[PDB]
């Protein structure tokens, strides 16, 4: 048969050599072309164990995205370790592209085809793949953007749902569009996000139903972030190379018991940012002139459940979580594992 191994994977993409876009440039040197005819072999009478929380593929992807950001981003001032460095900071072309991770000779990638897979333990429908699907290395907090959807219903994933210190990764089964804009010409840093109120609330109702399976007959509440760095208290993301920080209170302010307008999120383009790649602070130049606009698909979310008792009881509170970018890579790499053919 096969044994679980930690092999050095290679990458493949549809990166364009003519592009000045940062992800395309990195992938032109680090990656090979995407397999025109990729072969998937569905395995009969095979049950294999997978563990998304202990997946070495996450670590390799994390290393690649850190290097991509480090060699691509141009901050005016960088503070690391008590020392500061000033350099030229021209604006860049930034838009993630899908990246495939491929197994070398003597190795294979096993894929979990169980539509309801929780993230750990056995899986009955397994297939051998040469490469993973195309993964966009999206650096965002609270909401997972431009990822893959759950095939059947919404899937709640946690290493242990009963442990409040463990992150909850929600995978949606239908995309929720998020339209973000910094209008053309007043306050150059003022921006906003639009989300269909009815679509988001119905999504929240279905997330509450899936959460209630682990918290029987309990009221499910969504509340705002309890605190932390601006990167995690707010929904943070990239759009046209600019760092957007959105107040997400309106997205997490509902109570769900056993039973078309827009949500306008107030946003700010920040210049002083706390780095995720390493411990430090980075400063960028003011935003570019004109309309800064991007549309993204919310395909998942990161939640933390409130610890301790409540005065009333019978109610569990969930708040947007984050802090570790490995959980964003984990949300896409959950169905794969590296195995040695030998």
């Amino acid at each position: 048969v096969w044994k679980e191994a930690t092999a050095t994977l290679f990458c493949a993409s549809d990166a364009k050599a003519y592009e000045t876009e940062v992800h395309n440039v990195w992938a032109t040197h680090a990656c090979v072309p995407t397999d025109p005819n990729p072969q998937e072999v569905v395995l009969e009478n095979v049950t294999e164990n997978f563990n998304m929380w202990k997946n070495n593929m996450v670590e390799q992807m994390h290393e690649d995205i850190i290097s991509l950001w480090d060699q691509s981003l141009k901050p005016c001032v960088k503070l690391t370790g008590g020392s500061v460095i000033t350099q030229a900071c021209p604006k860049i072309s930034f838009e993630p592209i899908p990246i495939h991770y491929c197994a070398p000779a003597g190795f294979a990638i096993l894929k979990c085809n169980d539509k309801k897979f929780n993230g750990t333990g056995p899986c009955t429908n397994v297939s051998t793949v040469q490469c993973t699907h195309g993964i966009r290395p999206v650096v965002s907090t609270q909401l997972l953007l431009n990822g893959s959807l759950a095939e059947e219903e919404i899937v709640i994933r946690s290493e242990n749902i009963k442990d409040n210190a463990k992150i909850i990764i929600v995978q949606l089964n239908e995309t929720v569009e998020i339209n973000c804009t910094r209008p053309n010409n007043g306050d150059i840093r003022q921006a906003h996000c639009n989300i269909s109120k009815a679509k988001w609330e119905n999504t929240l109702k279905q997330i509450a139903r899936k959460l209630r399976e682990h918290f029987k007959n309990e009221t499910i509440a969504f509340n705002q972030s309890s605190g932390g760095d601006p990167e995690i208290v707010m929904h943070s993301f990239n759009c046209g190379g600019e760092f957007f920080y959105c107040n997400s209170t309106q997205l997490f302010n509902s109570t769900w018991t056993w039973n078309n307008i827009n949500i306008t999120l107030p946003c700010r383009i920040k210049q002083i940012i706390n780095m995720w790649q390493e411990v430090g602070k980075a400063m960028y130049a003011p935003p570019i002139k004109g309309q800064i606009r991007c549309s993204s698909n919310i395909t998942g979310l990161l939640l933390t459940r409130d610890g301790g008792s409540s005065t009333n009881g019978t109610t569990e509170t969930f708040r947007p979580g984050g802090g570790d970018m490995r959980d964003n890579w984990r949300s896409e790499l959950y169905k794969y594992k590296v195995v040695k053919i030998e």
Partner: antibody
Amino acid sequence: QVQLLQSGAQVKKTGASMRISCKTSGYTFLNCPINWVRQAPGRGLEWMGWMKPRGGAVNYPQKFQGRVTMTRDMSTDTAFLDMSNLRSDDTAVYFCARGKYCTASDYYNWDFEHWGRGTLVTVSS
Amino acid sequence: EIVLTQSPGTLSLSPGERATLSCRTSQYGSLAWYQQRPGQAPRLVIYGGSSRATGIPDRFTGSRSGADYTLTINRLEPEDFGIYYCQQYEFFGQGTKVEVDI
């Protein structure tokens, strides 16, 4: 050796605010959460919440929400606990605690093998 | 979310005797036992219901029988004097006092 060094005892007036610190060493501060556990005179142990040095993410029980703030200084590997509008009941020994199991990729928060000496806080008129 | 019921309130014994501490919980979660000596921080004794923590001698044992968890301290020493707490995640029992002296 994992070490949790807590700040000196404090004497506070009813209605005042406080700031307690916990300076860590012997491990990578970034790796796991810091917990705060209090003990009122002649009473049990009470968890006040956790704080993750990676991003400063927090988790507070309902009773401490709006009155407790847990933060950190990455440059000195120090965790801080802030508490507002102090009451006589808030008189307790405040401990910082860390779980036994902590690696660069995994941790279990709850098995508190590592504790600071505790910071006595006396609140009175 | 989890109430942990400790019994008895106080145990008054002599060195060399056996102490039997009880903790009741109807909930899932890895159970820990702590020893807290006067004026000191608590010390982890047992974790995962039955495993001994660093530097804990074999005379300290943890066991589980459904909702009933027990910490047994065989061959009691004067240094075993203190309050013992059980724990599941963020929840603690009210403690059991173990009185032992020279």
